Structure formats: C-alpha cells, structure tokens
From a paper:
The dense glycan shield consisting of 22–23 N-glycosylation sequons per protomer is an essential feature of [name]-[name]-2 S architecture. The glycans have been shown to play intrinsic and extrinsic roles in protein folding, modulating conformational activation and immune evasion. The transition to the ‘up’ state exposures of RBD for the binding to hACE2 is also a prerequisite for S-mediated viral fusion, directly correlating with infectivity. Here, we dissected the role of [name]-linked glycosylation, acquired by BA.2.86 sub-lineages, as a RBD conformational control element in attenuating viral infectivity.
To understand [name]-[name]-2 engagement of the HS cofactor and how the [name] glycan alters HS usage at the molecular level, we determined cryo-EM structures of XBB.1.5, BA.2.86, JN.1, and BA.2.86-[name] in complex with HS at 3.2–3.8 Å. Interestingly, incubation with HS led to marked conformational alteration, yielding substantially increased ‘RBD-up’ state in the [name] glycosylated S-trimers, but had limited impact in RBD conformation modulation for S-trimers without the [name] glycosylation. Due to structural heterogeneity and flexibility of HS, only the density for part of the HS basic unit, IdoA (2S) (2-O-sulfo-α-L-iduronic acid), is clear, allowing identification of the location of major binding sites and interactions. In contrast to binding of sialoglycan to the domain A (corresponding to the NTD in [name]-CoVs) in HKU1 and MERS-[name], HS mainly targets a semi-open, shallow, elongated cavity composed of a number of positively charged residues on RBD, downstream within a deep groove, named the [name] pocket, constructed by the residues [name], R355, K/T356, and R357 from RBD and T157 and F168 from neighboring NTD, is occupied by the HS fragment. The HS fragment is poised to possibly interact with R355 and R357 through hydrogen bonds and a salt bridge, meanwhile residues K356, [name], R346, and R466 might contribute to further coordinate the oligosaccharide. Notably, the absence of the [name] glycan in the immediate vicinity of the binding groove probably facilitates unobstructed engagement of HS, in line with the observed affinity; however, the presence of the [name] glycan together with the bound HS widens the binding groove by 3 Å, pushing the neighboring NTD outwards and thereby conferring a relatively relaxed upper arrangement. Strikingly, all the [name] glycosylated SC2-VLPs exhibited a dose-dependent enhanced infectivity upon HS treatment, reaching up to the infectivity level for their parental variants and loss of the [name] glycosylation largely eliminated the HS-induced enhanced infectivity in BA.2.86, indicative of differential usage of HS as a cofactor for modulating infectivity of the [name] glycosylated variants in furin/hACE2 enriched microenvironments.
Residue numbers in the entry: 23 to 68, 80 to 138, 158 to 210, 212 to 246, 263 to 304, 329 to 482, 484 to 525
Amino acid sequence: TTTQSYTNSFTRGVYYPDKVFRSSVLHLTQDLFLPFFSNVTWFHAIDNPVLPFNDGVYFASTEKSNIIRGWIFGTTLDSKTQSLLIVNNATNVFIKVCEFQFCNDGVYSSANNCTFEYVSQPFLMDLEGKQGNFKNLREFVFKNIDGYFKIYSKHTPIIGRDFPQGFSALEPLVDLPIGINITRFQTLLALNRADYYVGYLQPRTFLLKYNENGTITDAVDCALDPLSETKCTLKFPNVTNLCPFHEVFNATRFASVYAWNRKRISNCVADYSVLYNFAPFFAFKCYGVSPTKLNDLCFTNVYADSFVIKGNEVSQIAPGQTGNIADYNYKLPDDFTGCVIAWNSNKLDSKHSGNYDYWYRLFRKSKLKPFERDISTEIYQAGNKPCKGKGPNCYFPLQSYGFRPTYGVGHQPYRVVVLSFELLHAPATVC
Ligand SMILES: *[C@@H]1O[C@H](CO)[C@@H](O[C@@H]2O[C@H](CO)[C@@H](O)[C@H](O)[C@@H]2O)[C@H](O)[C@H]1NC(C)=O
Ligand SMILES: *[C@@H]1O[C@H](CO)[C@@H](O)[C@H](O)[C@H]1NC(C)=O
Ligand SMILES: *[C@@H]1O[C@H](CO)[C@@H](O)[C@H](O)[C@H]1NC(C)=O
Ligand SMILES: *[C@@H]1O[C@H](CO)[C@@H](O)[C@H](O)[C@H]1NC(C)=O
Ligand SMILES: *[C@@H]1O[C@H](CO)[C@@H](O)[C@H](O)[C@H]1NC(C)=O
Ligand SMILES: *[C@@H]1O[C@H](CO)[C@@H](O)[C@H](O)[C@H]1NC(C)=O
Ligand SMILES: *[C@@H]1O[C@H](CO)[C@@H](O)[C@H](O)[C@H]1NC(C)=O
C-alpha cells in the first residue's frame, strides 16, 4: 500500500539554472523552480500510484541503502505510445526511450520500435560511516523543456530533521534529448525479506546568492512574500571524425513530413563543403548563422531533420510561417538557429505508372508545437459524430503525396533536410 500525507518543503529544491560560474554576485533567474513553502506529498511503501507530470517534478527520498531503482515516464504507459525508463540497475543506469508494453509487477516486454537508449554512470551514491544512521537524502529534479530531458541531483546526509529545511543546491548529471510527450510519471521499487518525496515545479523568478567559490548559499523567491518581492526588486577540440552528413544526404527513404526523421549529429568535425557537393542547392536559407561562416563555429549538438515535401512547402518551411505543413506536419520554432536545405529529387521519388509512397497531414485537432511529431491515424471529427470509420464528415487525417516523374516544379518532389545548430554556452561537440 501507500499513504499520501502532505508536508512542507521550506527552502528546498533550487538547482544551478546554467553552467556559468559566478562569484560575489546576486544573479536573478526566471525558469522552472519548486516554490518556497509549496506542498510536497510525502508517501510510504509496504499500490505505486501513477503520479501526474507537468512542468517538471522535484523528487526527494531518504532510505537506508536502496529500495528505489528508477522511474517510468510517457503517456498511457502502453504499447501504443513511446515511453521512458530510467532504472538505476546495480552500479549503473539503464535510460532508454521505447514503446514499453506492460509488466504489472524484467520491467517491460517491449522490443518493437525502441532502441534510442542512453547508458551512463549510476545516479545512486551511498556511503556509511560504519553505521546505518547516515541516512543520506537524495534529491532529484526532472524537467522536459522542449524535450532535452534534464536531470539534476544532490546527495546530502546528516538528516537529523525530516526533510532538512536548510539550503541545498542541485547539480546536473545528464541532459539527453528524448523529445517525447510526457504527462504521467511512475516509480520502481526493490525487494526485501519514509521516502517518495514529490513536488511539482512552476514558472517562477528566483534571486540566487552565489559564493566566491560559486556555491549557491541562499536564494529568495520573488512571488511569495511582500518582503521577498521587494528584496527581489533591489536584488577546435581533439576530434577528426567527419560528420555523417554524407548518409544524411545519401539516404534513399527520407521520411514523409508526418514523421520527420530527426538525426542527431555529435562527436564530429563539420565541414559543410561535402554538404555542398551532394546537392545542387535550390534553397539554402539560413537564419541563425551565415552559411559562409559555418566552418569557424562550434555547435554543442546538430539535428538533421530530413523529409521530402512539395515545392511550395519548401518556401513554407521557415520560422514563423503558415500552411497545412507548418501547422499540422512540421513547425520550425520562431527563434530557430540553423539552416534549411532543399534540393530537387525527381529521380528517386518517381517512376512510370506512378508512386504514392509519401504522406502528409492536413487534419490535426490543433497546431503542431515546435519540433513535435504526431504520428497517428485518427479520423478527424466533423459535426458532433466522432467517426474513425472514414467517409463524408468522417475523414482520414493523412492524404497522399503521390509522386510521379511529370509534374510542374511547384508539384515536383523536393528533398528537404533542415539543420538545427546549438550556439549556447556548453561543451562544444561539433566543430
Ligand atoms: C571557498 O574556498 C576556500 C579556499 O579553498 C575555502 O577555504 C578553505 O576551507 C577549507 C575547509 O573548508 C580549509 O581546509 C582550507 O584551509 C581553507 O580555509 C572556503 O572555505 C570556501 N568557502 C566556502 C566553501 O563557502
Ligand atoms: C497544502 O497542504 C495543506 C496541508 O495538508 C492542505 O490543507 C492544502 O490544501 C494544500 N494545498 C494544496 C494546493 O495542495
Ligand atoms: C545495468 O544495465 C546496463 C544496460 O546497458 C548495463 O550496461 C550495466 O552494466 C548494468 N549495471 C551494472 C551491471 O552495473
Ligand atoms: C512502429 O511504427 C510504425 C509506424 O511509425 C508502425 O507501422 C509499426 O507497427 C510500429 N511497430 C511497433 C510495434 O512498435
Ligand atoms: C502531452 O500530453 C498530452 C496528452 O497526452 C498531449 O495532448 C500533448 O502532446 C502534450 N500536452 C499538451 C496539451 O501540449
Ligand atoms: C587534446 O590532447 C592534448 C594532449 O593529450 C590535451 O592536452 C588536450 O587537453 C586535449 N584537448 C581536448 C579538447 O580534449
Ligand atoms: C550518394 O551516392 C554517392 C555516395 O555514395 C555520391 O557520389 C552521390 O553524390 C550521393 N547522392 C546524393 C544525392 O547525395
């Protein structure tokens, strides 16, 4: 079973917003943070309630050695939507993104459209002074800002008070881009023959005091108390491996725009001159960076979203645009920093007697959020009758991009690959 008693969080759950060292400074940040004094649910164990996930979750736990392994994320937690899994097995982790089926207790039996996994050093550290009284308190913070699942942690012992209220910062451990939809949240247990602290983050403005050593000593909220609000107001590397752009441009089944195959590029040397050779460029509209000055810049990560679309939709693809593709199929974010590449390909998307392999979505319940995929076949509703049967007033969502060797250029196949560069203060992986 379990219990759902409520307690107070006090001044707890503040993590270094960036990776920028600061000294004798009173830097003010706006991001997701756990509100000061803000209602954290303390649970027990002796079944395992699936907790809602929104705007990140603050998770703390006090245990003897180990009874909590990891966490599960995703939506509907079934074999119809991709899901996460972060079990800290033994002295390592097991992070992965896969459409997990079920276990109802080997935590999954899914080996389908999965892979896309990330392993790393274990997130569980325990030390004892020859005695078990050293009940170290493990605090974690997770968030899913436009994917890029972020994870923060900090282990601190000498827990003489239930949920110490003293200040404690949180250091990041790993930042892997899952790029999925997360709404639910669940936790794993262990075996044997008082923990589960859970708080939710909300968008707040924090004012943080930084020590000369960079350690965050004190922080004050700016939306909690009149005094707090007033106080707030007054306050290239050793790489030679050429990037796989070759395959990116030498693929044969650049997917349809309804499933934009995103390709992450890292640990490589990006000489775009090869990118200039596998494509008589018809459109090289770069927004965040000048294409001439691309060989003197270092990007922490590069994303190569590849999809073939029609001619007008090439002009459609741009930051802040409109159309049946820019709303329901692929929406580039407004502050895009990257390049779009669209050369012609009427030799691989054509044949006599025709071809209709490709696809696109004219019918979605809402607009597509920036960099989000929506692969699903649901009949669009009309009137007040939910169909899923197909016909008038009952429409299938995606209609075909049937390509043939003889259309006008406005209808001719256009191979589009869009590069999303990362120009932000962080370890440079691509140069
Ligand atoms: C910031 O860094 C200083 C230089 O390392 C710290 O001073 C030291 O403190 C350690 C023990 O904490 C001593 O062993 C050493 O001799 C020296 O005095 C200083 O404490 C630290 N300030 C912090 C962590 O707030
Ligand atoms: C906060 O916790 C108190 C004590 O259990 C409870 O009465 C109150 O309703 C909680 N507020 C919210 C919004 O959860
Ligand atoms: C946990 O599972 C991962 C799966 O890749 C494995 O690499 C790791 O070695 C395991 N943990 C251990 C044995 O410490
Ligand atoms: C994987 O997804 C494709 C469509 O994207 C679907 O046809 C296929 O059945 C899926 N496989 C599984 C079971 O994950
Ligand atoms: C994440 O989950 C919801 C429900 O599954 C889904 O509609 C959407 O992709 C995400 N949330 C919203 C409303 O943006
Ligand atoms: C490259 O190797 C040299 C020699 O070992 C080392 O000093 C340097 O720090 C390395 N650079 C990077 C970015 O790893
Ligand atoms: C792909 O094939 C070879 C490399 O295998 C290359 O010469 C050719 O230009 C490539 N074609 C395109 C369109 O990228």
